[PDB]
Design a binder for this molecule. Structure first.
Ligand code: CLA
Ligand code: CLA
Ligand code: CLA
Ligand code: CLA
Ligand code: CLA
Ligand code: CLA
Ligand code: CLA
Ligand code: CLA
Ligand SMILES: CCCCCCCCCCCCCCCC(=O)OC[C@H](COP(=O)(O)OC[C@@H](O)CO)OC(=O)CCCCCCCCCCCCCCC
Ligand SMILES: CC1=C(C/C=C(\C)CCC[C@H](C)CCC[C@H](C)CCCC(C)C)C(=O)c2ccccc2C1=O
Ligand code: SF4
Ligand code: SF4
Ligand code: SF4
Ligand code: FES
Lengths: 158, 99, 130, 38, 58, 745, 73, 80
């Protein structure tokens, strides 16, 4: 569906479950049970099995080479593969994009602003930090207040 | 803005004045505010014409870019980046004295 | 204006066959100082007048500038010796250093505008101007 | 002042923040490995 | 004009359409009789400049 | 006279140990103490961190900054040595390695299983999992004779407390008691204690460790005793008669040494030479004999120079009396040169400790010192190559400060007609005859490699330079190997075995694996040594041009007035790009990598073809690459095909294995190498105008910094393309060498 | 094939990036406001004002043939 | 055969003549600022174009433009 087959029921994807643990069990049969290198392999056996049960219940969409694939055609059924990772990404990318701008206005209204960019005012840098989970309803207000963008006849230009 | 006194003297012309300055104001700006002409080029610390010699006192001359380490070891201060942090007496017209 | 004198040194890195331009930086000293020849090495600097033949004018000025800073003497003169033998008296140009302001004003290569006020190179088409 | 204000120089105030913000990504990969989604 | 901040209008400088800070206006018929200082230093490391009286807008 | 003027002259409490100059950086110079108006200030904060001559003209407080900073360097060595001995204790298989060191791989790193990075911990035997490791401490700890796991845990806590003393000593010598310049200019006494009380006692007490500990341990290890069943190192000291059951000379005692019957100690201080076929390495009784041989005449060479008590060769007087007819005034003036400027002293010290470490790399592979390092071909490859590159890097630093001294601390008034001045006077004939011989060598070394490549391409194989062709037999290098096989018996009559088995004699093989085979120098080594003679000559062509044209040239007659490290003197005189003595080091560092990569490629192909491999009990020898250096080494396609393309197959067919970390570094350092050429081919004025677009994108958004974001400066921009190139030129040779020999061997 | 067209579209935009810089900054800038009076192919402006290697629009052309061969490669 | 013409900003900051190691810059007294001097360039035929005036030139942008045109054996700096 949506092109290729789901990997919830895929023989090549289930073969990649098979020969990987068959490769990894061949390392297990040269040790003895009870040693700490034995427990390091058998714990690494189950984290590959549960990984192969994570992608089965996740509903990833791939076939013909036994891999998982991802769909970025804006699909709301496939929103867990790209969209809500990006929606948490673009959330507090916009922290650091906004509180770096918020830090760089109160530092300009100082005595010596040149030293203060590498010698931090940590009560002001943390003082402008935690107003960053609520950026874009204030940044859009900043966009329509007017002073987010200076006028073109006062910028540095060639 | 504190208060400081600089006794300037040019013996080639023969003018001895006592000017008053602050911590942010330059020395020749206080000389122009008392009506004393002094040689200068662009007020940057990057020429040689505005050179004075510190006879007595203590001068923050650190914002200049023309004079090197040894040439300021004899006490040659450009009067346009100078923050006078003490009560001083300065010989001026030392533009040929640095080189 | 030139005269036969000496300089007093030894060297092995100097002018080649050169016959388009040479000179003589001639000056009077005060002591037997030791100075770097600008092509390398050292010399002994006899206390009267003494001269140096070198190749090109960068070596001639950088010996005249080195003589002004260390063991300060404002009396170095710079000629130019042609292959035919003519002299020039190049550097002070009338008895004084050019950082001092003259009374003879020639005033050439002096454009009378700001550096933005210069025409476009379409306006200087197939001719020679800035 | 002046020792905690030595811990406001941009490398060292960066690095004890970079020790923090690296290890935030390390220890969420401890408890939730192998994540293509959510 | 003494004192306060003066914006520039000439091009070909580092500080173009910037804030400016005027000092000691000259009266001699010199073409560029203001020696206005700036913050935010240029490529030469010179935070000051002199230009003419035709580029003030204050 | 200096009859009481060798004494200590110490200031008490010079600098208050405070915090206010500790957090206001750039505090060592006038040009950096007034804050970052530009972003040149951050890159000048790191470049002027150790440029102490640009901080103060007082040589007394320059030399106190040197002596305290060495203690900070030496504390880093003890902290790093504590990391090696502690990871031998808690994170190792060394105690399992001593029971069978012929097939158990070394391991000193257990990776945390976090991101699925646990696949790098390979099955290296011993009931233990971990990263296969190749610095070779395991054969060092068998050479010193550390048996159990407790002694590695005690040394690293004994090494950490040696760092805490050494870090405290630099604190004491800058903040409580600092020496003066009278103390540092007593160089006739410093060479006394360094020859005698540093290297002599460094040998003689180490000869005490080898005879009393490492010889009874390594006489009982190779017999077949388990390391739990060997008596302790403090049982070979308090029990003299237990040593008597190994060497019968210890039943006598100290009376042969005191009464000079020194031939009674021949049973444990021998001159065997060669190898030890039981344990795979040097005879340890020879090494125990070698150290107190150096000790008893380093301390003899310690008392050479003039001291407080009258006697001694004065260093000012032996230099002054070496004048000659060609050399003018001789060395009159060089003693005042070397006891004023550290850069003059660093320029001689770096060429020596550089080119002693190249002697270390060559006197280790063909004479394997440590037991059971002979079979471990990964440790021989990594201990060769690492001692090359340190000797390759520290030799270009000898011409760094050889040129920094000339522009800073060379006064020509003190150097009239002496030996340093005379080569500035004839500096054309130095470089031009070096300029001729590089074109002579590179036509006669690299031009033959084209000439064998064309003749193989043109079909006519009888017109190249090979064994079955026009032979270029290296008859000098084939002769000295025939001398050292007559060095037993004939020329050094008391040496029983050979000086080294690389010159000839017999094979030595340990548990089937070949310890050392005789290297047969053939006609493919006449050319590759001439490659090595060519690219060494080009590195001294750039660097000696950097020293002799550091003061001035015919381009610039006042080059020293602009400084050492400056970009240019304008595009006039046709262009003066890369004209400083900094750029001669920057150009000379590149040909060092273009030199030393060939030396380790000559190492990694000849020793993979002629000495290493396997030995059948009949005596049949089968090498790794089959001995393909006789034919395929003579052409540049053969260096591409049979060596570069063929031996990298173990690197790139190594995913899913424990060597898969090396394949990531093998792609890591292709990337950083082709990150260098952005910094190297481009200029500055492009990027500064490209940054000029981005400052518009921030000043539109009230986002511009109060500091000025600038492009990197030109010497700084050449330096970042230099260091990227030498990470990506070395790191992929690192990741191909280690991934090949661990896989195939 | 999804990822490798983005390797092309990296090189399509970057070779555009040097040359739309190379077109539009032939005339002037802040580093050199009178670049038009010097010409298309001049060496540099010297080491002054920070240093000015590869400032010309010819040297702004020069970097893209590296990126063109990187892109079509 | 260069062309090192000096523009109208030209404050008489006498260091371009100092930084010139070929004496092709020369101060000329001229009606203007408080320094009352301008920098003149007589020896354009004698210059090398090594741009040493422009590095010590604290105007808005470059009172002494340098712009390099023609050339000879003097300007190319050969000792042979
Ligand atoms: C030009 C490429 C492009 C772009 C910019 C978007 C953009 C978007 N798509 Mg989308 N989409 C694309 C191609 C694209 N899609 C393709 C090729 C298909 C298959 C026909 C779809 C089918 C699709 C669905 C079914 C949905 C989106 C949705 C969305 C929105 C989230 C976002 C505006 C969601 C939405 O709300 O938009 C209708 C949604 O539910 N997309
Ligand atoms: C205050 C931080 C800050 C902010 C808000 C921006 C914002 C922006 N930058 Mg930018 N930048 C920054 C710092 C910042 N930059 C730094 C430090 C550098 C030097 C490495 C650059 C180099 C740079 C380039 C080269 C380019 C941009 C571009 C852009 C624009 C597009 C977004 C983008 O791709 O970002 C780009 C982001 C990066 C390349 C990496 C982020 C840099 C660091 C990690 C962020 C600073 C974090 C800092 C610690 C925050 C302080 C807060 C607190 C600790 C007090 C946007 C206006 C582009 C542009 O012009 O588009 C219009 C562009 O081409 N930036
Ligand atoms: C037991 C043998 C022995 C003997 C006979 C000497 C004898 C001497 N040493 Mg000596 N030395 C010895 C062992 C010995 N040392 C050891 C074991 C070391 C440490 C490795 C040194 C390190 C040493 C130094 C560093 C110096 C001497 C110096 C001297 C000379 C003058 C010392 C004095 O008393 O006045 C004298 C010739 C001093 C001298 O002037 O050397 C010629 C001197 O500076 N010695
Ligand atoms: C026999 C005595 C002796 C010894 C062992 C040393 C040893 C050393 N000196 Mg030294 N020195 C000595 C006498 C001695 N010196 C004298 C008499 C002078 C004055 C003329 C100097 C002047 C001098 C200078 C100017 C410098 C050194 C440096 C060094 C170090 C070189 C690094 C090295 O080779 O790695 C080998 C390293 C080791 C073997 C580490 C172990 C070191 C242990 C702790 C022994 C140290 C002995 C020490 C002299 C005892 C001081 C007494 C104190 C406890 C009160 C090394 C630690 C250089 C250095 O690194 O500075 C620290 C340096 O810059 N020394
Ligand atoms: C410098 C280091 C050093 C130290 C601390 C010692 C210390 C000692 N040695 Mg010794 N020794 C050394 C070097 C050293 N030796 C060297 C270089 C040789 C070879 C010439 C010897 C040869 C030697 C013999 C032959 C004997 C000792 C013995 C002894 C012990 C009693 C005396 C004592 C522990 C004796 C012993 O075994 O202990 C009683 C003994 O018989 N030593
Ligand atoms: C005995 C060792 C030694 C010592 C003490 C010095 C000391 C000095 N050198 Mg020097 N040098 C040396 C060896 C040494 N050098 C060698 C071996 C070379 C040839 C490679 C050079 C080449 C050299 C040049 C070309 C210059 C100096 C300069 C200096 C001075 C200041 C250095 C400074 O502040 O750097 C501060 C420290 C750094 C900038 C560290 C940078 C780290 C580099 C990039 C290596 C990092 C790679 C890393 C280890 C591995 C990869 C990391 C990973 C992230 C990929 C100082 C006098 C400079 C100077 O001004 O002289 C007066 C100068 O111009 N040296
Ligand atoms: C593989 C690339 C390469 C090559 C071949 C060269 C070549 C050379 N470099 Mg070089 N160099 C390079 C990259 C290269 N460079 C890089 C990347 C840098 C920057 C780090 C430098 C930096 C550099 C410096 C700093 C120096 C050199 C020097 C030299 C010369 C060494 C003498 C020699 O062997 O000449 C012999 C020439 C060859 C071996 C080239 C091959 C010619 C073959 C053998 C035969 C000719 C073909 C054909 C028969 C000719 C006739 C036909 C033709 C007319 C059509 C030589 C011209 C040195 C120099 O100029 O003085 C000697 C020197 O000091 N190089
Ligand atoms: C493989 C070598 C290589 C690489 C990676 C780059 C990378 C880049 N070049 Mg570049 N370049 C190269 C060779 C290279 N160049 C060569 C040979 C030339 C010819 C001289 C040029 C000429 C050139 C020009 C002329 C231009 C570029 C531009 C760019 C940027 C493109 C934007 C981009 O991809 O953003 C992503 C950035 C990268 C891919 C760079 C690598 C980033 C790494 C992988 C991540 C950060 C490092 C990370 C923190 C690792 C830890 C480090 C550790 C020490 C802590 C980027 C910085 C353009 C530019 O700057 O526009 C903005 C531009 O105009 N380059
Ligand atoms: C070392 C060989 C140098 C020959 C010096 C011959 C010799 O005896 O010189 C000795 C001579 C100095 O002798 P003096 O008579 O001046 O002795 C006084 C001084 O030695 C003491 O102050 O040095 C020179 O002539 C300088 C030019 C040497 C030319 C160096 C050429 C280097 C290339 C040759 C290297 C070959 C190495 C491999 C050989 C297979
Ligand atoms: C790309 C390039 C630049 C531009 C490179 C720049 C401006 C470097 C930008 C990267 C710096 C190193 C970012 C530093 C940011 C700090 C690490 C802070 C980041 C925040 C946290 C990591 C703490 C040059 O200046 C240059 C100069 C000469 C020749 C070639 C080139 C060249 O190729
Ligand atoms: S920067 Fe590069 S190009 Fe511009 S001058 Fe200095 S060297 Fe010549
Ligand atoms: S350099 Fe600029 S400022 Fe100094 S004199 Fe020449 S023109 Fe006037
Ligand atoms: S042109 Fe070259 S020489 Fe003439 S002044 Fe400018 S820099 Fe000095
Ligand atoms: S007057 Fe020109 S620098 Fe002060």
């Amino acid at each position: 569906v949506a092109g290729l087959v789901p990997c919830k029921d895929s023989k090549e994807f289930s073969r990649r479950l098979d020969l990987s643990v068959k490769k990894l069990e061949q390392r297990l049969k040269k040790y003895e049970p009870g040693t700490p290198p034995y427990l390091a392999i058998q714990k690494s056996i189950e984290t590959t099995k549960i990984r192969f049960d994570r992608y089965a219940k996740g509903g990833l969409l791939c076939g013909k080479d036994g891999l998982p694939h991802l769909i970025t055609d804006g699909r709301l059924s496939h929103a867990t593969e790209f969209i809500i990772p990006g929606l948490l990404f673009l959330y507090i990318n916009g922290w650091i994009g906004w509180v770096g701008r918020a830090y760089l206005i109160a530092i300009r209204s100082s005595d010596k602003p040149a030293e203060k960019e590498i010698i931090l005012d940590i009560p002001l840098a943390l003082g402008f930090m935690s107003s960053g989970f609520l950026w874009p309803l204030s940044a859009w207000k900043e966009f329509t207040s007017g002073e987010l963008l200076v006028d073109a006849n006062e910028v540095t230009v060639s | 803005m504190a208060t400081y006194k600089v006794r300037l003297l040019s013996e080639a012309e023969g003018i001895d004045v006592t000017i008053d300055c602050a911590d942010d104001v330059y020395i020749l700006d206080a000389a122009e505010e008392q009506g004393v002409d002094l040689p200068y080029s662009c007020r940057a610390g990057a020429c040689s014409t505005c050179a004075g010699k510190v006879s007595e006192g203590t001068i923050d001359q650190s914002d200049q870019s023309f004079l090197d380490d040894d040439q300021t070891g004899a006490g040659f201060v450009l009067t346009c980046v100078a923050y006078p942090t003490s009560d001083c007496t300065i010989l001026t017209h030392q533009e040929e004295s640095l080189y | 204006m030139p005269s036969p004198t000496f300089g007093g040194s030894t060297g092995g890195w100097l002018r080649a066959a050169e016959t388009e331009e040479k000179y003589a930086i001639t000056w009077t000293g005060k002591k037997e100082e030791i100075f770097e020849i600008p092509t390398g090495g050292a010399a002994i600097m006899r206390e009267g007048d003494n001269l140096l033949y070198l190749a090109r004018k960068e070596q001639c000025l950088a010996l005249g500038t080195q003589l002004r800073n260390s063991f300060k003497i404002s009396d170095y003169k710079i000629y130019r010796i042609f292959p035919t033998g003519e002299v020039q008296y190049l550097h002070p140009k009338d008895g004084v250093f050019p950082e001092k302001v003259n009374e003879g004003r020639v005033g050439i290569n002096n454009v009378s505008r700001n550096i933005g006020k210069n025409p476009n190179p379409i306006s200087v088409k197939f001719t020679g101007k800035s | 002042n002046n020792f905690l204000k030595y811990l406001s120089v941009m490398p060292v105030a960066g690095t004890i923040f970079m020790i923090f913000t690296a290890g935030l990504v390390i220890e969420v990969n401890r408890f939730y490995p192998d994540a293509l989604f959510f | 004009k003494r004192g306060s901040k003066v914006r520039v209008l000439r091009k070909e400088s580092y500080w173009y359409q910037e804030i400016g800070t005027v000092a000691t206006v000259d009266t001699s018929g010199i073409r560029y009789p203001v020696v206005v200082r700036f913050e935010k230093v240029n490529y030469s490391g010179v935070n000051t400049n002199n230009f003419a009286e035709s580029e003030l807008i204050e | 006279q200096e009859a009481k003027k060798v004494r200590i002259t110490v200031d008490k409490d010079p600098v208050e140990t405070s915090f206010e100059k500790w957090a206001k950086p750039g505090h060592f110079s006038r040009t950096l103490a007034k804050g970052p108006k530009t972003t040149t200030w951050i890159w000048n904060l790191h470049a002027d961190a150790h440029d102490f001559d640009g901080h103060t003209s007082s040589l007394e407080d320059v030399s106190r900054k040197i002596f305290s900073a060495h203690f900070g360097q030496l504390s880093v060595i003890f902290l790093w040595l504590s990391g090696m001995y502690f990871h031998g204790a808690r994170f190792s298989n060394y105690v399992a390695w001593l029971s069978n060191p012929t097939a158990i791989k070394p391991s000193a790193q257990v990776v945390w299983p976090i991101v699925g990075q646990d696949i790098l911990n390979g099955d290296v035997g011993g009931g233990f999992q971990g990263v296969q490791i190749t610095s070779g401490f395991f054969q060092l700890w068998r050479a010193s004779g550390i048996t159990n796991e407790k002694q590695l845990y005690a040394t690293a806590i004994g090494g950490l407390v040696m760092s805490a003393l050494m870090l405290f000593a630099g604190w004491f010598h800058y903040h409580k008691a600092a020496p003066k310049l009278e103390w540092f200019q007593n160089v006739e006494s410093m060479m006394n204690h360094h020859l005698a009380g540093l290297l002599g006692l460094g040998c003689l007490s180490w000869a005490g460790h080898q005879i009393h500990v490492s010889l009874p341990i390594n006489k009982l290890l190779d017999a077949g005793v388990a390391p739990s069943e060997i008596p302790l190192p403090h049982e070979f000291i308090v029990n003299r008669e237990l040593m008597a059951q190994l060497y019968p000379s210890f039943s006598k005692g100290l009376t042969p040494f005191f009464t000079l019957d020194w031939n009674a100690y021949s049973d444990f201080l021998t001159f065997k030479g060669g190898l030890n076929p039981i344990t795979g390495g040097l005879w340890l009784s020879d090494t125990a004999h070698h150290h107190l041989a150096l000790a008893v005449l380093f301390i003899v060479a310690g008392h050479m120079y003039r001291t407080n008590w009258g006697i001694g060769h004065s260093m000012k007087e032996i230099l002054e009396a070496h004048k000659g007819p060609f050399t003018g005034e001789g060395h009159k003036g060089l003693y005042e040169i070397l006891t004023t400027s550290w850069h003059a002293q660093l320029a001689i010290n770096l060429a020596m400790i550089g080119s002693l470490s190249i002697i270390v790399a060559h006197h280790m592979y063909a004479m394997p010192p440590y037991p059971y390092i002979a079979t471990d071909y990964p440790t021989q490859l990594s201990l060769f190559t690492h001692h090359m590159w340190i000797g390759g890097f520290c030799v270009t630093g000898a011409a760094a400060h050889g040129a920094i001294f000339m522009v800073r601390d060379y006064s020509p008034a003190q150097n009239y007609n002496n030996l340093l001045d005379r080569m500035i006077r004839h500096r054309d004939a130095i470089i031009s005859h070096l300029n001729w011989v590089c074109i002579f060598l590179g036509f006669h070394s690299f031009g033959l490699y084209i000439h064998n490549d064309t003749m193989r391409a043109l079909g006519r194989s009888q017109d190249m330079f090979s064994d079955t062709a026009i032979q270029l037999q290296p008859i000098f290098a084939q002769w000295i190997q025939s001398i050292h096989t007559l060095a037993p018996g004939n020329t050094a009559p008391n040496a029983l075995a050979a000086t080294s088995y690389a010159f000839g004699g017999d094979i030595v093989a340990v548990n089937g694996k070949i310890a050392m085979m005789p290297i047969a120098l053939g006609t493919a080594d006449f050319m590759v040594h001439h490659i090595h003679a060519f690219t060494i000559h080009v590195t001294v062509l750039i660097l000696l041009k950097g020293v002799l044209f550091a003061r001035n040239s015919r381009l610039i007659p006042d080059k020293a007035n602009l400084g050492f490290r400056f970009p240019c003197d304008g595009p006039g005189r046709g262009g003066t790009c890369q004209v400083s003595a900094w750029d001669h080091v920057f150009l000379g560092l590149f040909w060092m990598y273009n030199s030393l990569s060939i030396v380790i490629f000559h190492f990694s192909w000849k020793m993979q073809s002629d000495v290493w491999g396997s030995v059948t009990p009949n005596g049949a020898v089968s090498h790794i690459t089959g001995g393909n250096f006789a034919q395929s080494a003579i052409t540049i396609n053969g260096w591409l095909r049979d060596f570069l393309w063929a031996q990298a197959s173990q690197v790139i067919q190594s995913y899913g294995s424990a060597l898969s970390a090396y394949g990531l570094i093998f792609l890591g350092a292709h990337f950083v190498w082709a990150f260098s050429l952005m910094f190297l081919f481009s200029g500055r004025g492009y990027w500064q105008e490209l940054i000029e677009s981005i400052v518009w994108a921030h000043n539109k958004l009230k986002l511009g910094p109060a500091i000025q974001p600038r492009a990197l400066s030109i010497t700084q921009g050449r330096a970042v393309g230099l260091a990227h190139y030498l990470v990506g030129g070395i790191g992929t040779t690192w990741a191909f060498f280690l991934a090949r020999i661990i896989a195939v061997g | 094939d999804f990822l490798v067209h983005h390797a092309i579209a990296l090189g399509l935009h970057t070779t555009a990036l040097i040359l739309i810089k190379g077109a539009l900054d032939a005339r002037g800038s802040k580093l050199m406001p009178d670049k038009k009076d010097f010409g298309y192919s001049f060496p540099c402006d010297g080491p002054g004002r920070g240093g000015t290697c590869d400032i010309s629009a010819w040297d702004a052309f020069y970097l893209s043939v590296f990126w063109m061969l990187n892109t079509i490669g | 055969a260069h062309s090192v013409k000096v523009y109208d900003t030209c404050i008489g900051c006498t260091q371009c003549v100092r930084a010139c190691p070929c004496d092709v810059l020369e101060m000329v007294p001229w009606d203007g600022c408080k320094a009352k001097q301008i920098a003149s360039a007589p020896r354009t035929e004698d210059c090398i174009g090594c741009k040493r005036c422009e590095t010590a030139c604290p105007t808005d942008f470059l009172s002494v433009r340098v712009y390099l045109g023609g050339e000879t054996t003097r300007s190319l700096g050969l000792a042979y």
